[PDB]
């Protein structure tokens, strides 16, 4: 018998999440037969990767950051690498892939196709990782994703003292205040210390309230990845209670995707905004360029997982459920998203595909599950 | 001794507006003391144009609808005419020119560059016209702008019976319901009966609440202009009392521009939305494609006039006043507009220009006044 209310105890909620996740795993694996149980892939918590497993994933990402970019130079002058190709299409489409009916599915297809690049162009044969925020909400610096060792996605940014607070503005609502974290400078430890962020900033929120924005964020702007790990943000938005809340208290797709992303004006940024802004720095604090932070892919692995859990809890009603339009917060107004709506990743990978073919992890081009 | 509170009598409010406009005229001509009294242009009510002067203007617009487009085909494949060049750039920039700090200035520059094309490519030597909404709020079908004669911008459209209401949505707020007008179909008469609208639809609101959106609204879609004149929209949002309230109750530029465009959630679409949607039809009900309705230019003449009046009531504080950001309703968040923000019209006409050179009708490229 599944839980129905999220516990306020962290240990309790974590066990509730396991139960629901196991429920969804059972639902997926039982119904599967192109995708079969025999060729079904499994995505796992970063913490369950062995040291060699972690290093194989990291090395494949590094490979992508070394290979020439496919995007025609005249459409994205700043692109240099295959990794940049994914950042550039995200930047290019930010205003029709967040707070839209396509947000969840687009990102599902996005990370799938990023995974395909690792496998087909960088000889990656491991499992797709996800970052379970709940386990790190008490100390982000100790997260295996961000501890700075050679099995992490590099570490914190170097310490910059006396940083003012972050002030997140959307529309005309009052700013959401956030502390600035423990870093702020370049990330100079771990396997990405030599990584060059090449695109943006498009809309970079800064300590103190300012926002930096390039004239054209697709032009060349080589610089260091910065971070300022902010545990306090995870403590507010990404604890195991908040994760289970999101799954159990959302009765339709609208409430789920909006609770996940944060209801504008509500004071909360959800698990999705909480994971992003907990990284801090650059592009961590830039909704357009966020894939430029290597932890993006683990973050959205967990996003896709929580959606997949929520879907499988009431499959018949939820698998193909869509709500919202084709424009950011429906500004300007645009038609409702439908199963016939087509999305694409530009020159990053793959091709145009209908929403219809993205709603199940065991259908269309998808054949995977979460453990 | 100027009015300070708007009157509810349409007769008194009309005289109040006349006093405020006459004050603004005095202020501007006094300021003019390369803009001089000897070269200052006067923009005038369409109702003040003689029959010959009206036909002179219409014929120049028709000339622009026959001259070949400048836009590179690969950027706007549906463009055919110089008129299309203006429609195309508006479509392309709609999301950064409405509910932005640049809204008022951008449209001032837009209609001036349209005037440039009339004067330099179609031999126009007359005055720029404006549509005084308040004088037609009692019956739009008798408006000299919309009466369907050879001195109108064409008139009403073919009858469509038993139409549903227009339902205007923005972000989350409940719909503003508008009646669907006394027409519906292609214009039946007047100078633009055979005029072909080539771009869009991009986001065309329809009777009953649906919206039509082309996959790419910059590709070729030749069709008639449709109209459904809606006097009740003018009665609700564009009477002389509503015009005077906008001017006299707005104590800063944020409030002025937002009251003009309609505050989301307020139930009102302001004089700006009222003028647009009162035309009904296609592209009248399409925020991206609206310059495709030939009355657009007279509508935005009045918009600019009302801004000019408001500026001249306190020039020291209002001449150069700006508020807002570079994105529609600041979704997603973007930096504040400043006097150094640059706007441009693509290939429609002219070069890039900074906000600081747009704030006065008697500075920068501008040397005109309203009577
Ligand atoms: C709609 O708005 C977009 C964004 O402002 C406009 O995009 C701009 O288009 C031009 C022309 O394609 C791009 O520029 C230059 O062309 C030369 C080759 O002649 C190339 O070598 C340069 O690198 C550059 O691409 C420009 O970069 C591009 N800007 C952005 C931000 O993408 C578009 O032209 C507008 N469409 C219409 C119909 O006005
Ligand atoms: C950003 O998105 C736009 C729209 O999807 C892309 O524009 C297409 O670009 C190709 C190649 O220049 C054109 O043939 C199409 O006509 C364009 N479509 C539209 C609707 O304009 C653009 O290429 C994307 N840029 C990147 C870097 O992905
Ligand atoms: C999943 O299936 C196993 C049997 O294969 C069962 O023991 C377990 O209780 C199931 N989990 C849930 C949450 O139903
Ligand atoms: C914010 O930007 C302004 C200029 O717009 C600058 O003067 C100020 O120092 C900046 N504030 C911080 C905290 O960096
Ligand atoms: C925009 O201007 C307001 C003042 O009206 C200021 O408080 C805010 O910080 C500015 N926004 C940014 C992103 O700097
Ligand atoms: C405008 O100036 C004229 C001429 O000086 C004057 O007669 C009139 O009263 C003025 N109008 C206003 C509203 O100040
Ligand atoms: C969008 O869907 C809602 C129901 O979720 C519907 O009421 C509305 O009319 C739709 N919008 C359009 C523009 O058709
Ligand atoms: C509105 O759109 C829906 C969805 O396509 C359609 O079923 C309905 O018939 C449309 N109504 C009108 C009046 O066009
Ligand atoms: C367990 O720990 C979480 C943080 O991970 C708290 O938010 C919760 O209230 C409980 O103390
Ligand atoms: C209108 O009223 C004002 C009051 O200040 C006078 O200054 C002016 O002469 C006119 O009578
Ligand atoms: C203003 O408008 C009202 C009706 O809207 C009339 O009663 C008045 O005479 C003036 O035309
Ligand atoms: Cu995204
Ligand atoms: Cu994200
Ligand atoms: Cu406009
Ligand atoms: Cu307008």
Residue numbers in the entry:
A (entry chain D), B (entry chain A): 5 to 37, 46 to 383
Would you copy out the relevant sentences from the publication that reported this structure?
Coupled binuclear copper (CBC) proteins contain a type-3 copper site that reversibly binds dioxygen. Tyrosinase catalyses o-hydroxylation of monophenols to o-diphenols (mono-oxygenase activity) and the subsequent oxidation of o-diphenols to the corresponding o-quinones (diphenolase activity). Catechol oxidase only catalyses the latter reaction, and o-aminophenol oxidase catalyses oxidation of o-aminophenols to o-quinoneimines in the grixazone biosynthetic pathway. The overall structure of AoCO4 shows a four-helix bundle around the copper-binding site, as seen in all CBC proteins. In AoCO4, His102, His110, His119 and His284, His288 and His312 are responsible for CuA and CuB binding, respectively.
Two new crystal structures, called met/deoxy (an average of met -and deoxy-forms) and deoxy, were solved at 1.8- and 2.5-Å resolutions, respectively. In this triclinic crystal form, the citrate ion forms crystal contacts between molecules A and B, resulting in symmetry with two homodimers in the asymmetric unit. In the met/deoxy structure, the copper sites of the A, B and D molecules were refined with one water molecule between CuA and CuB. In met/deoxy, one water molecule is refined between the copper ions in molecules A, B and D, but the distances from copper to water are relatively long (2.3–2.4 Å), and therefore it is not a typical met-form. The copper centre does not represent a fully reduced deoxy-form either because a clear electron density for one water molecule is obtained. The copper site has features of both met- and deoxy-forms and from this perspective, the copper centre is named as met/deoxy. In molecule C, a peroxide ion was refined between the copper ions. The Cu-Cu distances were 4.3, 4.4, 4.4 and 4.5 Å for molecules A, B, C and D, respectively. However, some signs of oxy-form are obtained at least in molecule C. We believe that met/deoxy structure is only partly reduced, and it represents predominantly a mixture of met- and deoxy-forms. Interestingly, the signs of general radiation damage, such as partial disulphide bond breakage, were only observed in the met/deoxy structure, probably due to the higher resolution.
